[PDB]
Amino acid sequence: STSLLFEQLNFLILVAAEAELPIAHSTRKLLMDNSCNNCQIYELYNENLKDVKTDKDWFMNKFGPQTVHFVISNTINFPFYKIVYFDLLIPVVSHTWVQDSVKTKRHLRTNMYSPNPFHLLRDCQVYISKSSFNKCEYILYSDLLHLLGGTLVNYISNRTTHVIVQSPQDPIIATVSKLTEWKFVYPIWILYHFKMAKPLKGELATLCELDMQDTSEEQLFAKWEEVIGDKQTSSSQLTLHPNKTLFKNHHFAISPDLNFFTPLYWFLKGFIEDLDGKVTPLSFSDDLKSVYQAFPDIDCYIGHSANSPILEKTKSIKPEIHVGNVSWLFYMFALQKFTPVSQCKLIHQPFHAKLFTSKELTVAYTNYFGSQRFYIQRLVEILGGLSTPELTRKNTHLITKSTIGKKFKVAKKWSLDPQNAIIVTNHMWLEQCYMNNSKLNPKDSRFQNFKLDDNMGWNIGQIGM
C-alpha cells in the first residue's frame, strides 16, 4: 500500500515514552511507504535535555540542515516546542494526522491535529466581518483566534463554522439572510476561550450568540461584562502559560490610533495587568512631553501604524523606547519571554504604509501549512494585497516554497503566456518587499529559488529577525 503522497517532505517523530515506540514505528512505516524523504525519530525520554539551551540554533543543528516540514507528537511538553511552533512555524501534529492523511490521500489541514490543549478552536473555520470592525479590532481578533488554533477564512462557505460580528447592525447579517450551517457570534466567543482556557458552554455560550434584540451599545456592554468581566472564578489550564510576571517592570503606552471598542480595551488592559505590566492610554489631545515626564517608567509604545505622528513625537522624546504592535504582546505571551521587537518578526512592528494594490497583488499560495498560512496571509494583507484560497486567472502571483504539487504545475504553465502573465515567485519576495518598503522585482534570481526546503533559515518568517 504505497503512494507518492509525502514526496520530498521531511518528518520528525517525537517519542515521549518507551511505550510509544510501537506507534512511532507504525507512523514511520506509513510515512516511508508513502514516499517521505527523511523521517527522523527522536526519543525525548532517553536524553537529558535539562540545562541544554534547546533554542533555534540547537534545533537547526540537531535536526537540519534540511527543513523539518512536520513534527509528529501527541504532546507539547518538550523544551523546543515554542521554537518549533511559534518561531520556525513548523506544524506540530498528532499521529492521527499521518493515519488520516494516508487514508484520504491528501495533505490535511494541520490545525485540528494540534496536541496543544490551548488550541480550543482547532476545529473552527472563522470569518471575521470587516464591516463590523475597525482595522485594529480585526487584527486583534485574528491574532487571538490563530493563537487558539482556529483557521481564518476571507469568505463564507459551507465549511465556515463561525461568523464574528459586533452587533445586529452589521450589513452582512441581512446580506446573508437574503442568500440563504454556521453560527453568528460576538467576539466574546473568541475572548472567553483565551481568558478562561476551556470550552464555552451553557448560559455563557448563549450570551455570545448574535441576538437581533441587542439594538443598542448598552446591551452589548452588558453581555461583555457577563461573559469576560469580573468572573472571580479562576481560569482553567493554569500551567500552560505559567509566567505570571511576564511584563513585570514594563509600562505600555497605548496609541490612540488603536481605537478599540471600550470593553475590548478593558480586555487588553486586563491582559497586560494580569501579567504584571502597566498601561497608560494616550489620547490625541495629550501633551506627550508631560505624559512621559509624569510616568517616566513608560518603556513600551503599542500602536497600529508606523507613520503615526504620536509615534514620531514619542521616539523623539523617548529614543530607546520599545516600538511594537498588539500582535507583539501576544507573541511575547506565546514565547513566555519578554522579547525586544528586533528579535521578533516583521509583523510585530507597527504597520508600514500600503505598498501594493489588489490589482498588483492578488496572490495564491501552495505548500504552506498551519501557521505559515496565517503568516503569509497577514503579510499580504499588510502589504496592501488580497490572498485567495484557490488558484484562478484573477491571481497576479503564485507564492511557492518548492516545485511539488498541482497549483505550481498549472501556474508555471500559465507563466509562459504572453500578455496577462501570472508570476511564480517564492515567499521571500513578500518578506523583502515589506522589509525594504519597496516593490521589488519577483523575477530576480533570489526569489525564483524553489529549493528552500534545503535550509531551515529560509522558512517564511525568518527574514527580518
Binding site: 482595522k135 469568505y155 462557505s157
Partner: peptide, 16 residues
Amino acid sequence: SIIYEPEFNENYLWAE
C-alpha cells in the same frame, strides 16, 4: 464552494 465573498476594501488597514 463559496456563499458570500465580500468586496475587498483597498484601504481598510489604513482608514482613519
